[PDB]
Amino acid sequence: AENLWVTVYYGVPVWKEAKTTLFCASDARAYEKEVHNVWATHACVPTDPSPQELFLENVTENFNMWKNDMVDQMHEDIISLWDQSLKPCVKLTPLCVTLICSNATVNNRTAYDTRSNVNVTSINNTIMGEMKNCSFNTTTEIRDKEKKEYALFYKPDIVPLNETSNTSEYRLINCNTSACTQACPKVTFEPIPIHYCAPAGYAILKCNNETFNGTGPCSNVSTVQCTHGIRPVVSTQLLLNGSLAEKEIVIRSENLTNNAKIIIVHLNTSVEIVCTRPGNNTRKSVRIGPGQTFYATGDIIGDIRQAHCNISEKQWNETLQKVGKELQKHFPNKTIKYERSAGGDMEIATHSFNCGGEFFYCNTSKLFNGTYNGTDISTITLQCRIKQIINMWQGVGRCMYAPPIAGNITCKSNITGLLLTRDGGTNSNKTEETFRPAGGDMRDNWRSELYKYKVVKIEPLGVAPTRCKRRVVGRRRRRR
Amino acid sequence: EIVLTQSPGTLSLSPGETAIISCRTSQYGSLAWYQQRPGQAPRLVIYSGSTRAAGIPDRFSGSRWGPDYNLTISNLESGDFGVYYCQQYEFFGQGTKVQVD
Amino acid sequence: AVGIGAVFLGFLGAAGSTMGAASMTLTVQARNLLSGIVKLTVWGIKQLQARVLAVERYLRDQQLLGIWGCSGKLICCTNVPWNSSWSNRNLSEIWDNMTWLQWDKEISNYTQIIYGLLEESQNQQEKNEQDLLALD
Amino acid sequence: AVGIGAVFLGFLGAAGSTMGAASMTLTVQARNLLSGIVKLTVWGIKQLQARVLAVERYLRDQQLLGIWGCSGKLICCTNVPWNSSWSNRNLSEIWDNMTWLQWDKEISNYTQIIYGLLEESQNQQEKNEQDLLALD
Amino acid sequence: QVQLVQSGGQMKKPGESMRISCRASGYEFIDCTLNWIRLAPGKRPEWMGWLKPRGGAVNYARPLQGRVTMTRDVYSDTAFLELRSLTVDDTAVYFCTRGKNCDYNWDFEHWGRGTPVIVSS
Ligand SMILES: *[C@@H]1O[C@H](CO)[C@@H](O[C@@H]2O[C@H](CO)[C@@H](O[C@@H]3O[C@H](CO[C@H]4O[C@H](CO)[C@@H](O)[C@H](O)[C@@H]4O)[C@@H](O)[C@H](O[C@H]4O[C@H](CO)[C@@H](O)[C@H](O)[C@@H]4O)[C@@H]3O)[C@H](O)[C@H]2NC(C)=O)[C@H](O)[C@H]1NC(C)=O
Ligand SMILES: *[C@@H]1O[C@H](CO)[C@@H](O[C@@H]2O[C@H](CO)[C@@H](O[C@@H]3O[C@H](CO)[C@@H](O)[C@H](O)[C@@H]3O)[C@H](O)[C@H]2NC(C)=O)[C@H](O)[C@H]1NC(C)=O
Ligand SMILES: *[C@@H]1O[C@H](CO)[C@@H](O[C@@H]2O[C@H](CO)[C@@H](O[C@@H]3O[C@H](CO)[C@@H](O)[C@H](O)[C@@H]3O)[C@H](O)[C@H]2NC(C)=O)[C@H](O)[C@H]1NC(C)=O
Ligand SMILES: *[C@@H]1O[C@H](CO)[C@@H](O[C@@H]2O[C@H](CO)[C@@H](O[C@@H]3O[C@H](CO)[C@@H](O)[C@H](O)[C@@H]3O)[C@H](O)[C@H]2NC(C)=O)[C@H](O)[C@H]1NC(C)=O
Ligand SMILES: *[C@@H]1O[C@H](CO)[C@@H](O[C@@H]2O[C@H](CO)[C@@H](O)[C@H](O)[C@H]2NC(C)=O)[C@H](O)[C@H]1NC(C)=O
Ligand SMILES: *[C@@H]1O[C@H](CO)[C@@H](O)[C@H](O)[C@H]1NC(C)=O
Ligand SMILES: *[C@@H]1O[C@H](CO)[C@@H](O)[C@H](O)[C@H]1NC(C)=O
């Protein structure tokens, strides 16, 4: 080696695909760090999320959306946030006294859906009729006096028939397994946008060639310090308040032939949905213990019989048509036939979401009742139901009670993606066409947004041959 | 479609002799083999093509490229006779019966 | 394999280009490796863990540079000759074809020898210089 | 008092030998000084405390070396003469008999003078070199 | 550990319904996919359906989706099955089944001991 010597280099552009804990960057700014919680005021950092994107000349990198651990990071952070935020609040254990319940009564209100006054709850069947009026003995603050309070509960929140089939006595559903906790009113928190910023020594790469199938090389790579605004919304059978693909509709699965694997459909044009609970709910406040207050719905005043969601007919129809066309491309020479929800628990057999702190459940049979590459050849109304007692995510053991919100509540959303599954055994000539809506873990929701990103650690030290021997001689070498 | 098709359905094999079974596959996907002990619950043997299941001796082996797999069981003992099934994501082949002479 | 550096790129924007057209972000790469980003809750533990791990990474890298006599510089010529076992590499593509992201793969499986070689050579030079100063 | 250095001993294996031989293991002790080792629970505080104290000790040592003009080297010759008050130490026993573990007990009660003398001489030399450069 | 218990056999009349139970143990029942396979004698084993105990999501083989209903109970670690309307052609053994990692739907585990049922007239 008379012409050949090593050289140390530092600050060199090299990286490897490790894993690490990412920083949480807020909207800049909506956080009052302790006064109230809007998403993560106690925990997350308010700072400038400016991505400052940089394009790279000739980089080619392999992305995988299914193995993206950032969705697991989101899962853990969300669960920790909810668990630590709900911990200080009131416990519902004293409220598990025996409840005597009866059908509700209406003091001469009026019905939207017909031009006549309310006559009977059985015919005026919405809100009123599905909601029971319950009275129960409760302890006062001094522990030696008790009083007959009353509150109105939704039928899913109470359970007869373990109190024998002739008693008209009801419990709260949670007491069979666990004890709930009320949501603190000052803590009430909503889908604030969140940004993930890499820690020092790590770089977050992003792929701009949006149309890649989800597992393969990407050439239009770019580097970003903080990811774009991801909204931590959770919903089933339909993604809402999401992004939109620049190309037409996009479909994603690690193997479409693998029928059990979920199929995420990502739209390019949003379809507007409006959901409303008319009628003015009156927030009753009843005392428990020395310094705890429990909130419940008293009488509902104003016009009552509606709990609806509305979707534009032709817009949703054409959206489903384009989904059908793309799935016909992927599944050649056969129709596409959407169908009712398969079944299962109501949290996934129905479209689920929260507006203004009130959890909604909506029958979606009106929506997927389609045929060949579209619907068969004006607004579609979804009947809905409401629960107050909530199991936090799918089937986790942490229960929660949602206090009612007074007055009429209305919300709007942009539908951006769908969650589908496929029929199984065959019967080949008459099976490939069928598709249904399906539930989804929150990983499935957050994957549609953390699709783009990957995390790599910098390896800033490298070695290479150069022309120098330390203080001694030069070099003879080669060229391209 | 007709994703699986095993052959030969019927096989006569003496003890200590090598067995041979074939399973076609008309679509891309995983493949495997199951051992139905007669009058008992079947059990996994080979999966993901050639990789053996847990606790299976080295008599059981096979391989494929694309639309044709060959299974071979060298020197089959008396206890391992029965019926063998081919599976791919949901389907089952019609099965192949091996009896001891 | 070398060229006149710059800092206005902000971050890792090259990348991609060959080593002779990529070993120029050394100032900014060194800068961003450590600087930034910056009722009871525990994510202070997470933040402190990230900060401490980054600091320890930087300190280990700087120590490894210091042992080889390279601390205080980004570029650093050294005395260790090219290995007796290699004498083969594709230098025509080192100078103007391979980017760093590619070249880093070819030096793998052999890097562990180079650190020991550098350390031994530096310590030999250290004692030699001490003896030279002690000569008179 | 000096020897051709080594790193293959892994850790503190010498020790014991005289200063003229124990002064070869500088690299490995320098390396291992900082590197490694790496539902609600608090021992994350313990781990962070240990890591932070280790890093702080290393930074203090490196700063003290830097003030004396020695940062970037393990061996470091300086200019401060042997103290006017000492002129007596047992150097025949320094070179080949006393190990570092023994010699460290004898330089005690006097090290604080050296940690001032070194920085005094270094600052004098610094301003002298600055003046020499300014002379042109 | 994996263990798939099942109920005993029984005899049914045409047009009547049957129920079957299968109980889990030794693992997390909520997170792990569960399956069911019919196994009739002397012909193709047939697929029947899937079950995801976390959300209770299900999916059915097309020729049976007009009859099958598949449910579970998390607090008892028990899966359940039913045929809403039987026929003599349904005579077969029923095998509740997992996957060993069960990040992959296919099975790839027990195959518990099974349960035979016959429809006769
Ligand atoms: C998907 O994206 C849509 C937007 O595209 C979101 O829509 C918002 O939904 C939130 C609830 O989730 C709405 O928030 C509520 O708005 C009420 C009306 O606000 C107007 O009127 C008040 C005065 O009455 C003005 O001050 C205000 O500036 C608006 O002009 C508020 O009255 C409500 O107040 C309650 O909540 C706040 C915050 O917690 C409390 O501080 C208050 O004391 C009070 O309790 C509430 O803020 C919002 O209006 C909706 N925006 C639009 C444009 O419709 C969806 O929420 C989002 N997610 C989903 C699942 O759809
Ligand atoms: C969602 O879509 C439904 C159906 O299109 C809407 O229902 C409509 O609601 C209005 C009141 O908000 C009803 O108006 C009343 O109509 C009667 C005649 O039927 C009239 O006598 C009354 O004076 C009053 O105008 C309307 O009838 C009703 N339509 C139907 C078909 O029942 C609903 O308003 C939409 N929005 C929401 C938030 O639900
Ligand atoms: C969403 O709403 C639709 C319409 O209200 C519900 O459809 C109804 O579902 C019930 C229960 O599955 C069906 O009952 C069955 O009816 C048949 C006769 O058709 C009877 O033989 C059965 O014994 C059983 O009683 C009902 O027919 C069906 N009606 C319609 C018009 O679809 C649907 O169940 C709702 N889904 C959810 C998830 O809320
Ligand atoms: C796939 O299905 C679509 C329809 O779902 C077929 O294309 C044509 O689409 C237009 C726009 O949606 C249809 O007109 C619309 O019909 C709806 C009723 O579904 C109506 O509410 C709107 O006001 C508008 O009239 C049009 O009828 C439909 N053409 C036919 C022959 O149905 C498309 O042809 C299908 N794909 C293939 C390969 O045939
Ligand atoms: C729900 O039930 C409560 C208790 O029965 C009702 O409250 C009482 O209503 C009667 C008239 O129906 C009044 O005379 C009482 O003064 C009310 N209070 C109490 C403490 O008894 C309440 O009206 C019912 N609400 C509905 C919507 O039916
Ligand atoms: C409502 O109005 C009708 C007709 O005026 C009357 O008969 C009835 O008593 C009123 N109150 C209730 C609770 O129905
Ligand atoms: C479902 O679509 C068919 C199309 O032929 C229609 O006849 C039927 O009334 C629809 N049912 C519902 C509940 O939308």
Side-chain angles (χ1 to χ4, degrees), chain A, chain B residues 1-27 29-64 66-101, chain C, chain D, chain E:
Chain A
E2 63 174 1
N3 274 293
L4 295 174
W5 296 271
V6 306
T7 309
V8 190
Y9 282 67
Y10 193 61
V12 71
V14 174
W15 37 257
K16 300 287 164 62
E17 56 263 42
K19 307 188 187 304
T20 191
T21 302
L22 302 174
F23 284 3
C24 173
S26 193
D27 74 317
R29 186 275 318 155
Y31 282 10
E32 305 303 334
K33 71 179 180 179
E34 62 185 70
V35 173
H36 79 273
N37 189 30
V38 65
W39 187 248
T41 60
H42 300 174
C44 175
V45 186
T47 179
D48 189 5
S50 186
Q52 300 295 309
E53 188 180 322
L54 300 175
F55 184 56
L56 316 179
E57 191 193 328
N58 302 315
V59 179
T60 294
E61 179 58 22
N62 289 302
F63 284 77
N64 190 306
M65 59 161 303
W66 308 108
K67 306 299 186 178
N68 180 14
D69 62 78
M70 261 185 288
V71 309
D72 299 296
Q73 185 62 36
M74 274 272 285
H75 194 78
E76 298 302 324
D77 283 335
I78 294 280
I79 284 163
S80 303
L81 272 170
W82 281 81
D83 286 358
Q84 82 181 351
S85 61
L86 295 176
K87 190 165 179 173
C89 300
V90 177
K91 277 68 171 180
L92 277 296
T93 301
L95 193 56
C96 197
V97 187
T98 298
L99 318 180
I100 291 160
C101 306
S102 67
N103 288 344
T105 299
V106 182
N107 51 43
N108 294 124
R109 302 301 97 209
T110 304
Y112 308 96
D113 299 2
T114 188
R115 62 210 83 199
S116 181
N117 302 124
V118 169
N119 190 52
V120 66
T121 188
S122 67
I123 305 302
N124 301 108
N125 63 6
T126 291
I127 293 288
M128 271 305 128
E130 62 169 289
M131 182 179 72
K132 287 280 192 176
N133 188 352
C134 296
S135 61
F136 55 94
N137 280 325
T138 184
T139 190
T140 66
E141 67 279 346
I142 68 187
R143 304 206 303 98
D144 272 21
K145 292 290 192 178
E146 301 181 311
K147 60 189 291 184
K148 270 188 170 280
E149 261 293 348
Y150 64 92
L152 270 61
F153 288 114
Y154 299 91
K155 281 171 79 173
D157 288 317
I158 63 182
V159 168
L161 192 59
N162 288 37
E163 317 313 299
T164 315
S165 70
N166 52 15
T167 61
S168 297
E169 294 180 42
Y170 290 70
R171 302 185 289 97
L172 294 181
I173 188 155
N174 67 343
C175 294
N176 185 28
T177 61
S178 186
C180 291
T181 65
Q182 187 171 238
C184 285
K186 64 98 170 178
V187 169
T188 184
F189 63 93
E190 295 293 327
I192 293 287
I194 294 297
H195 310 259
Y196 278 117
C197 303
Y202 295 77
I204 287 155
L205 300 178
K206 190 180 73 169
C207 167
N208 298 10
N209 192 50
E210 69 282 335
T211 64
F212 74 106
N213 56 15
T215 50
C218 176
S219 59
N220 205 297
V221 188
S222 66
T223 300
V224 173
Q225 71 180 352
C226 297
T227 61
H228 80 274
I230 57 168
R231 309 200 81 130
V233 71
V234 180
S235 63
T236 62
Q237 305 191 356
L238 292 176
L239 305 174
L240 61 83
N241 287 5
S243 69
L244 294 167
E246 284 70 9
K247 184 261 289 181
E248 305 285 29
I249 297 169
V250 172
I251 299 97
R252 297 186 184 280
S253 83
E254 70 176 334
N255 264 318
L256 286 171
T257 55
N258 190 340
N259 55 20
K261 292 288 183 158
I262 194 172
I263 298 167
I264 305 177
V265 173
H266 206 303
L267 300 174
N268 77 324
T269 185
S270 64
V271 184
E272 184 163 305
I273 185 170
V274 167
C275 291
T276 298
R277 188 202 72 192
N280 282 2
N281 283 53
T282 64
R283 177 178 281 183
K284 202 179 201 295
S285 173
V286 307
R287 195 179 196 83
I288 296 169
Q292 284 71 242
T293 48
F294 170 66
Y295 296 121
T297 293
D299 192 5
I300 294 174
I301 202 76
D303 295 3
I304 46 174
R305 59 143 288 165
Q306 275 200 354
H308 284 169
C309 292
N310 284 356
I311 289 168
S312 170
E313 177 162 26
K314 196 173 75 170
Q315 190 166 91
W316 173 258
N317 190 2
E318 285 190 337
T319 301
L320 189 73
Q321 285 164 55
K322 291 178 290 194
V323 174
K325 172 53 180 184
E326 290 291 323
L327 297 182
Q328 189 165 8
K329 277 216 304 179
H330 278 279
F331 290 86
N333 299 332
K334 174 61 98 165
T335 64
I336 301 292
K337 191 167 186 281
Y338 309 93
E339 283 298 340
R340 203 185 310 212
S341 183
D345 190 6
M346 72 181 283
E347 183 162 318
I348 62 170
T350 61
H351 169 66
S352 179
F353 64 100
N354 52 352
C355 287
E358 196 68 15
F359 297 89
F360 280 80
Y361 299 83
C362 295
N363 181 314
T364 55
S365 65
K366 287 279 194 173
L367 195 63
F368 288 94
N369 176 37
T371 185
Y372 182 19
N373 120 123
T375 70
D376 202 357
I377 310 98
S378 179
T379 53
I380 288 157
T381 60
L382 317 179
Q383 195 74 5
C384 299
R385 311 183 78 239
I386 291 166
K387 294 177 69 173
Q388 290 173 122
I389 291 162
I390 284 292
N391 298 319
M392 201 64 265
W393 313 114
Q394 297 283 264
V396 71
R398 169 50 38 86
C399 317
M400 182 179 72
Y401 175 89
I405 295 95
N408 72 329
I409 49 173
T410 289
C411 58
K412 190 190 288 294
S413 315
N414 275 301
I415 289 158
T416 61
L418 323 174
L419 305 177
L420 313 180
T421 53
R422 189 158 62 85
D423 276 9
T426 61
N427 180 263
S428 62
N429 52 354
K430 304 172 186 179
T431 308
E432 303 176 66
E433 59 270 17
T434 302
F435 291 82
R436 298 174 193 288
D441 194 340
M442 311 75 78
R443 290 184 178 73
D444 304 324
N445 302 69
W446 299 319
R447 270 187 273 258
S448 76
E449 306 194 38
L450 310 193
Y451 181 76
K452 309 174 186 289
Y453 290 107
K454 184 176 189 176
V455 171
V456 304
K457 85 176 187 171
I458 306 301
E459 289 217 315
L461 190 150
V463 187
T466 81
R467 296 189 81 178
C468 169
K469 191 182 203 268
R470 178 188 273 164
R471 209 191 71 217
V472 175
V473 288
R475 169 161 203 158
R476 183 200 309 138
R477 69 165 174 185
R478 279 172 281 158
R479 174 163 195 239
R480 177 187 174 98
Chain B
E1 294 280 46
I2 176 62
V3 166
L4 303 175
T5 288
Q6 288 175 238
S7 185
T10 54
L11 184 64
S12 298
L13 184 85
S14 52
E17 185 57 284
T18 294
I20 288 285
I21 309 97
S22 71
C23 177
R24 304 301 307 274
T25 177
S26 63
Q27 66 181 8
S30 302
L31 207 72
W33 293 87
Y34 283 86
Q35 177 184 61
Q36 184 178 2
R37 293 85 53 82
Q40 294 154 82
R43 179 199 79 217
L44 186 73
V45 193
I46 310 105
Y47 72 95
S48 301
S50 63
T51 301
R52 263 192 302 285
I56 308 303
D58 203 295
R59 299 189 292 265
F60 301 77
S61 57
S63 58
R64 65 175 186 80
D68 183 15
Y69 193 110
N70 279 316
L71 171 59
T72 190
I73 316 304
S74 61
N75 60 24
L76 194 72
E77 299 172 33
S78 64
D80 293 324
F81 285 79
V83 178
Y84 285 90
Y85 291 121
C86 184
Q87 212 195 354
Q88 173 165 112
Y89 295 119
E90 67 275 17
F91 291 84
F92 285 74
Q94 65 183 358
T96 57
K97 182 177 179 180
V98 194
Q99 70 91 14
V100 68
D101 275 4
Chain C
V2 66
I4 298 303
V7 72
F8 63 90
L9 292 158
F11 204 59
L12 168 51
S17 59
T18 178
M19 272 205 287
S23 56
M24 271 65 58
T25 58
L26 313 188
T27 300
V28 61
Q29 290 285 2
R31 198 84 59 68
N32 298 115
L33 176 62
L34 177 136
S35 189
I37 304 300
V38 179
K39 301 186 184 181
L40 190 144
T41 52
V42 73
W43 305 354
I45 297 295
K46 302 290 206 53
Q47 277 200 27
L48 290 163
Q49 183 70 358
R51 278 198 272 281
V52 166
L53 191 43
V55 167
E56 271 206 350
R57 287 252 303 291
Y58 176 79
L59 279 168
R60 288 176 203 190
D61 283 348
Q62 274 291 355
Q63 185 163 265
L64 283 183
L65 276 162
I67 288 157
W68 310 333
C70 294
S71 176
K73 313 183 190 175
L74 306 179
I75 303 294
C76 177
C77 176
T78 62
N79 186 35
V80 165
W82 196 247
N83 286 343
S84 61
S85 64
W86 292 351
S87 71
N88 61 345
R89 295 296 198 283
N90 194 3
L91 194 141
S92 47
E93 293 179 353
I94 290 178
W95 191 38
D96 291 331
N97 298 22
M98 301 182 194
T99 192
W100 281 103
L101 192 62
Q102 292 163 313
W103 168 254
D104 190 83
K105 301 180 186 175
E106 305 196 11
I107 53 168
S108 187
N109 193 0
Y110 314 91
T111 294
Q112 72 291 348
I113 311 303
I114 300 305
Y115 301 161
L117 273 161
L118 264 72
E119 180 276 348
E120 292 165 23
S121 54
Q122 193 276 338
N123 203 286
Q124 162 51 23
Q125 197 148 55
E126 192 82 80
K127 208 271 185 178
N128 181 81
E129 279 210 303
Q130 191 273 328
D131 164 70
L132 182 137
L133 294 170
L135 188 88
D136 297 342
Chain D
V2 56
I4 301 299
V7 71
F8 49 81
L9 297 162
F11 200 59
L12 183 48
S17 61
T18 188
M19 281 205 295
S23 54
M24 301 146 177
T25 72
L26 312 184
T27 306
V28 61
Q29 322 312 338
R31 187 82 59 68
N32 299 116
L33 177 64
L34 187 152
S35 190
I37 305 300
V38 180
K39 300 189 184 185
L40 177 60
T41 51
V42 73
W43 305 345
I45 298 296
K46 303 296 207 53
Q47 281 199 26
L48 292 165
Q49 184 69 3
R51 281 198 270 282
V52 166
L53 276 296
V55 168
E56 189 170 306
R57 284 182 68 219
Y58 176 81
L59 281 171
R60 286 183 201 191
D61 273 348
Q62 275 291 356
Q63 184 164 266
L64 282 183
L65 276 165
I67 288 159
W68 310 333
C70 293
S71 177
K73 314 179 191 170
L74 307 181
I75 303 293
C76 179
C77 179
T78 80
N79 185 36
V80 165
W82 196 245
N83 284 343
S84 61
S85 65
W86 294 353
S87 71
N88 64 346
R89 297 297 201 279
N90 193 3
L91 192 150
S92 47
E93 294 293 328
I94 289 176
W95 200 38
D96 291 333
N97 300 21
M98 300 182 202
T99 191
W100 277 108
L101 189 61
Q102 291 163 317
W103 168 258
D104 191 88
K105 300 180 185 175
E106 306 197 8
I107 51 164
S108 187
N109 290 318
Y110 294 102
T111 293
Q112 74 294 349
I113 311 305
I114 307 310
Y115 293 171
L117 275 162
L118 264 53
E119 71 76 20
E120 178 183 357
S121 52
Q122 195 277 336
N123 201 278
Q124 163 50 24
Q125 194 149 54
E126 191 81 79
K127 206 268 179 175
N128 184 81
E129 280 207 307
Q130 191 272 328
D131 163 71
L132 180 137
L133 291 166
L135 181 143
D136 291 330
Chain E
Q1 185 168 13
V2 170
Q3 185 61 283
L4 279 296
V5 185
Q6 291 186 237
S7 81
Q10 58 197 347
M11 182 179 72
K12 254 60 178 173
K13 308 295 190 174
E16 182 195 39
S17 62
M18 64 182 73
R19 189 181 179 87
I20 299 88
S21 70
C22 166
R23 195 164 68 87
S25 186
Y27 66 96
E28 284 297 82
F29 181 63
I30 52 152
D31 63 358
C32 192
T33 290
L34 191 140
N35 302 340
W36 286 80
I37 295 156
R38 191 171 72 241
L39 180 61
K43 58 185 173 183
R44 271 187 169 72
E46 182 150 349
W47 191 238
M48 271 196 318
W50 293 271
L51 188 139
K52 287 84 175 187
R54 184 206 263 280
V58 304
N59 181 25
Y60 305 136
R62 189 163 172 88
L64 269 69
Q65 70 192 344
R67 308 190 291 149
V68 165
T69 61
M70 207 178 289
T71 80
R72 85 302 185 271
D73 184 74
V74 173
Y75 303 107
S76 302
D77 309 324
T78 44
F80 301 96
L81 189 136
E82 169 177 345
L83 269 290
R84 283 179 175 178
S85 179
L86 289 166
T87 304
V88 299
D89 291 331
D90 213 330
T91 294
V93 194
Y94 291 61
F95 287 95
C96 72
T97 293
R98 300 172 74 260
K100 58 184 174 165
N101 189 359
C102 68
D103 71 335
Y104 187 29
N105 68 347
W106 176 97
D107 43 359
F108 183 76
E109 183 46 29
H110 291 84
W111 296 80
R113 79 187 185 87
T115 179
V117 176
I118 53 171
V119 175
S120 61
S121 61

